[PDB]
């Protein structure tokens with residue numbers, strides 16, 4: 001099945017998922033000089049005060065923190081978006097070393113990790129219908145650089161020992177995703193795709209300009225997770241990122257001057 005290794009990684013995905021070579025694949029390099037300020041854009045509305053986290057799962061690719069998405073509890077609105085997008089899960093991508101790990105790049109710079117908060121457009125009723133639509137998802141992407149600890153990340157770090165291997169999950173209620181956001185909501189946006197198979201071209205990407213800082217010890221703990229299942233040979237969960245893809249006929253817009 002697909003993964004991040006040399007034999008099943010990003011260079012192989014197109015054989016099972018031919019959209020990997022499509023017209024609106026993600027991630028991309030954000031060339032900051034080429035991105036254009038768009039006064040048509042609004043401020044992003046991130047409304048997470050009623051978020052209800054459920055569980056944290058090691059799915060063999062990353063770990064996902066899942067939310068109750070049966071009601072408008074944690075929603076993204078505004079910015080480039082029409083309508084309301086409900087938070088369903090977040091996850092990260094990270095490297096084996098601090099100089100790599102992000103999916104998006106900024107002027108070719110790679111960050112140590114990237115957070116994806118995944119939301120689906122409520123007009124499509126549920127996530128599985130939303131992924132079939134060109135405006136079905138909005139993913140809020142946040143870069144992580146290594147420096148001071150992020151206090152709002154620590155509860156995630158501290159549960160990772162309980163989900164070390166593929167298929168493990170743990171209760172993860174009462175987690176506040178507001179604690180993962182930087183101060184500024186300035187962003188870049190473009191139309192793209194899921195960055196993992198099935199690579200569906202359903203995403204409005206909103207990538208914040210300001211990274212969050214996390215400590216070397218926090219990201220070290222991400223790198224102790226395993227891709228494998230319990231009882232199988234250990235393969236550390238590192239370098240679970242897709243590299244930048246061709247921009248093709250797209251424009252990246254900036255919310256800021």
Ligand SMILES: NS(=O)(=O)/N=C1\NCc2ccccc2N1
Pocket residue numbers: 066067068069070071088089
């Ligand atoms: N609304 S709910 O059932 O409590 N929460 C939901 N259901 C569907 C789903 C699937 C995967 C991840 C999160 C969620 N969230």
Ligand SMILES: NS(=O)(=O)/N=C1\NCc2ccccc2N1
Pocket residue numbers: 116118139193194195196197198
């Ligand atoms: N890294 S990403 O762009 O959020 N890709 C994702 N997110 C959501 C999701 C759920 C189910 C299957 C694949 C994917 N892929």
Ligand SMILES: [Zn+2]
Pocket residue numbers: 091092093116195
């Ligand atoms: Zn992702």
